Symmetry: D2
Subunit: 393 residues, 4 copies
């Protein structure tokens, strides 16, 4: 009778959860969000149904992910703790929002997810549920005392026992998340921050060492801070559709060893965690975007935006995408992107993304009025305050 | 009778100014600051004396530049407008401060400088003078109406040098010190002009750099670099000046540290610059990586929020200001126990942290039930916003 | 003929400038901005013509001042250096903007002002001119070496020679600026910050000592952070028009001794200055508005807004009203005011403005979501990080 | 065998908790903090022993409350959400710190408190325990499922007290210490309910206060109050406790320090409170006035930008956190040479600075030509912006 919409990935955790909820008497709808992971969605839907789902939704969210999520983060050049481009964090609110909309469509009273009881993704799901429809009841088995006792090999044994299909070959020994923006790799041997990742940790980018010994020049065009065109100046390739252009940046980046990050981050739930991230396309876009801002944005606007950029990234990381405070910052950050319009040429070569030229119709260089006397005054007035401080303390 | 301490580079501008002040009857002390530029300081001393200087100070300020200036910027991972590592801005307060101290030593009543009338460096000189000894009178010929009347162009400077018997390459304006070389103006002034490889003079291009990675272990204590070890060839540096120069060599040989950007000026509006900062690029990246494993999250968030302001103060010339003192109090506090070592892979322009260790981390206490409460309290506020709006 | 639009106040400085610009061969348009000063604008316009002006614009800007300037500052509860409600600073950009618009209507090539060469108002004028129309040339006689040399008693002597009328009685011995929002008093004896102002410094508010020993209760209603009604709960007066409502708050405040401030502020041009300010109506509105925000605004939004509110006030003080950075902040600050809608009851008594009640349809109080187990988890997760800091500061510190 | 140091108030909840812990077999040490509340501490100590505590510590923390907590908040003119002077929040870390110190002294392995399970004080206790000694085990009966099952309501507490021989007014929840008294809940819970004058118990109303102003001169050194002088009656205090109590007396007599607001909670959402903070209201106003003549503009601007965060840390219970240490380093630096005296007029609720003086000011060098350059350089950037907003906007 009772319906639950379960965020279903096809992996062992959500497959066990799906069976388990069916066994508890729920009508389970499996919701499969395609945000660019290189998964077999046909197989995943079959697995859900064989596991007991009444109905499967396979939702192609890739274009929306790009235009309304990745490009929104781009407004702040969002980087968490100086470094992390937030690939998992940017996807989760989109995935949860769509889950909310499906539950409303189905008249389901419950949403469920299989995020772990001790990570960040659980927060990103649940804060979104709360922000969009607080009337939906939330099921999180990894925080359920009963589930937690049963599954402290317990998951595989239960799959075998209950007729849940299981993977026909060994899983990679890392916890990995993948979407159109990045692949993350955590846990296993990576848990020790003094352990150097071996090359097999990486699955998208080639290493800078293996990347071709030849430069590629791209021109990336923006309008009010949004990418609108990528042109390969070597081979002539041109992309204008936002999804295709972003995918093309991923391709160029990955081929050329761009976008690897190895860091220890502070979690929202927990203390610290070591992650290895591969972000080929967004790495390129963020660098190009900042370069155009250099020639277009007012100095004082940039300074204030940069002051607030850590907060913007924190809100994304923590799961407050759909929060009043995010709306406050976005109002200003969007205003700052007005007339961030023009084109940047980037040289791409063995891991390096180097702006070499840029142009904007909205700059002084579209083909000042002071003198040395003005400088003298400007200095003298600023200096006054410093003299006073000295003549006292 | 009246003494002036002139910041003397040996170039045309300051040699002219030396003579000019001497002609006005000042006793000029020439102050020559060695901050790592490639100059013949012996020659410059001799020229100063021959031009009129009663005395010459040649000050080797390299070690102080590293320990008290570059390592101070490092406290905030200082980067102006996202990108710029401030090589010109970090040196100038040091040079100006030593100038003030000499004037105090000599009982000189004036300090003078030859920076230009529409750039940033004049501000960095004069704000340091003001902050450290407001009693000193400041001479700035390039903002002096009489000087500007007389020296309308380079030919005027050159002719005067010939008349007065003053002794005596690239189409870019360039500043060089231990931390960086900058290249601006000329063809670079157009931000749509791609710099020729010939613009770069310190770092090899990534394209020409060795096809084998270098691995360095960089050790820090309270945010201060204390050791560099080359993991493949065994080189170890512990002296701060030697370790910094070694980072410069490893970066330059491997194509690290190039930046091409347009920055907002303090005096003026926007300028396109090309900068080569090999060693500090490495250091800043290594430092941020160690902070990842050592710093409290909330400290880091606040520090990062304030880091643009910290960089702005450095850029604008407010090194010796009350507001810089305020920020440094906090930023130094944040660096307590930023202690450990980082392994970085250096390869054709890339500087990649691959491993790190600190004795002051939990790599040297809750359950899932707790997460449920943490989430629910946080979510409350969001549910209200929805129910009401 | 060269046409200049001069910001003309009718006082000694601008009358001399008017004359002088006539004597230098300009066609001068005198622009007189009525922003609520209690001046005889008929006499000012005549003085302008007697002094040589070709034409006079007397512009009633009071309503616009309230709705587009005072109410804009209110969005941030703007207070400069914790205290100053910015009455002079909020008026100058409106005055300068209208001046630019009159120069453009008239095809004047120049705008001019008489603000002093060493104060803040000059900046507020000239940054507005630059922001709105950089093609206009700016005349500032108090920064003009010639004008400056002549007028180091020298102004009064020149007025006499040129037939310029001068004031028929002694001026109050303070520098005073007045508009609908405040009266300011500086200089003279107030220059010494250890000098206690005597009661004759004050010219709008009664002192709290002199105010009636009787409370007044007002209800102030807001919609999206904008005042939309004032009701006197004792005597029934009601006002909804923004100008009338603001004037009424001025009246109630002044009668009840509200809005006096004595402080030393840091100038933008210069160092420090001691000022005495009387801001009766806005003092009330600012207090009421913050009280309503208590029941309506999200906590994290309020926190961010309050972090940025010093910058917002700085921008107003310094003259950057029409700057890109102000537009950036205002986008966020306006967003924070959505649904700041409701009513606040304030008790007004001998200088005190005390919120006693408030209501909003957009709040949880418009006529259970966690338990002690939730608290435990929330505390435990927050405590984790602190436990690590302790087991780090405890040990040997190298 | 195992020792617990319980923060003991003498009220019903902590008396029940003392007995309950004793019955579970703990050796309970009762810690009684005197932070200025008007309690009979002699009676409380006797009750604790009567109820089963093995030892009682009655700690007079009033002077330390002033010098190390109230004066620390003063460094940032701390005001939460524009208005709240943090009376409850400032006292709790002190109380908790001394509790940890007693536990350390007694070799106790547990600390306990009786703060409620859905309030803010429990956080202030427990974050302080975590920050100062994470080895201590924490007992919080109001978040313990067993205690909560047993004591579903006040009647259960009362019956247990009777049953176990535990010895033993206003329709508001009230917190009282040297800095303030707070009043919440009951009828005040409705923010549209105007508080009756009877809600107020410390300060007289402005309406009832004397119709004559009092003039005080308050002297500071490096942001710390060092002297108060009454200019009309000659009273003078320099000791920090005496001076603060004197400000409380003058404020309360003259109707100063009342606040009625809705604040956002840390645990929970919004709450309406009425607060009476006579002395500190005076001190905060005086302090800000002195800063006007002493502090550098840019320091003041940065400090004020950070002041909301400073107040948040205090409210939330992060007094002993690394991020607080970070801010304190800077905020203390800002107070160097905040030294001088301020004269305030106090009259029927008003605290008005009327004069001030510092030896560290120009009250103890540019020209008009300079203004022209300063303005022109600043204007450049605005002229560029205009020549780009006037364009076709794509």
């Amino acid at each position: 009778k009772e319906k639950v919409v379960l965020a279903y990935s096809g992996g062992l955790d959500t497959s066990v959860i799906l069976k388990w909820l069916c066994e508890k008497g729920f009508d389970v709808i499996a919701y499969v969000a395609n945000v660019g992971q290189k998964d077999d969605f046909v197989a995943i839907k079959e697995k859900a149904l064989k596991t007991g789902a009444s109905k499967v939704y396979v939702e192609d969210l890739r274009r929306e992910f790009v235009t309304d999520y990745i490009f929104t983060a781009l407004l702040g050049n969002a980087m968490y703790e100086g470094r992390y481009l937030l690939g998992t964090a940017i996807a989760r609110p989109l995935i949860a929002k769509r889950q909310v909309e499906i539950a409303e469509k189905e008249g389901a009273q419950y949403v469920a997810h299989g995020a772990t009881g001790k990570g960040n993704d659980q927060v990103r799901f649940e804060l979104t549920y709360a922000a969009l429809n607080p009337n939906l009841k939330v099921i999180s088995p990894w925080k359920d005392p009963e589930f937690l006792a049963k599954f402290k090999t317990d998951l595989i044994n239960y799959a075998m026992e209950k007729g849940i299909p299981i993977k026909v070959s060994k899983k990679r020994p890392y916890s990995e998340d993948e979407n159109l923006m990045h692949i993350s790799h955590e846990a296993g041997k990576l848990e020790d921050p003094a352990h150097i990742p071996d090359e097999d940790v990486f699955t998208w980018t080639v290493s800078p060492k293996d990347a071709p010994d030849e430069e590629t020049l791209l021109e990336i065009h923006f309008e009010n801070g949004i990418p609108v065109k990528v042109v390969n100046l070597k081979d002539g390739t041109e992309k204008t559709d936002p999804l295709e252009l972003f995918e093309y940046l991923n391709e160029v980046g990955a081929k050329n060893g761009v976008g690897r990050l190895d860091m220890v981050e502070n979690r929202f739930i927990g203390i610290k965690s070591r992650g290895v991230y591969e972000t080929p396309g967004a790495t390129i876009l963020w660098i190009a975007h900042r370069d155009l801002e250099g020639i277009t944005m007012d100095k004082e606007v940039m300074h204030l935006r940069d002051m607030l950029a850590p907060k913007f990234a924190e809100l994304i990381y923590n799961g407050f995408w759909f929060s009043p405070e995010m709306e406050f910052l976005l109002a200003a950050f969007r205003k700052a992107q007005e007339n961030v319009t023009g084109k940047v040429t980037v040289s791409i070569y063995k891991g390096n993304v180097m702006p070499v030229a840029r142009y904007s119709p909205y700059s002084l260089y579209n083909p000042g009025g002071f003198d040395a006397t003005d400088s003298k005054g400007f200095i003298n007035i600023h200096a006054l305050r410093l003299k006073v401080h000295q003549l006292v303390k």
